[PDB]
Amino acid sequence: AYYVGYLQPRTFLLKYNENGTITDAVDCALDPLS
């Protein structure tokens, strides 16, 4: 099975850990709390 999606220009916040890997992100447009 396969899936398809489309990207749009948006603003994210990304978290880096000591080793330098991405571990979490936040989407500025999702809801007022984000």
Ligand X SMILES: *[C@@H]1O[C@H](CO)[C@@H](O[C@@H]2O[C@H](CO)[C@@H](O[C@@H]3O[C@H](CO)[C@@H](O)[C@H](O)[C@@H]3O)[C@H](O)[C@H]2NC(C)=O)[C@H](O)[C@H]1NC(C)=O
* Site residues for ligand X per CB under 6 A: 17-19
The least CB distance from residue 6 to ligand X, in Å, is: 33
Long-range contacts of 21-25 (CB under 8 A, 24+ apart): none
The least CB distance from residue 14 to ligand X, in Å, is: 16
The least CB distance from residue 24 to ligand X, in Å, is: 13
Please state, in angstroms and rounded to a whole number, the distance separating the CA atoms of residues 32 and 28: 8
Q: Residue 16 or 27: which CB sits closer to ligand X?
A: 16
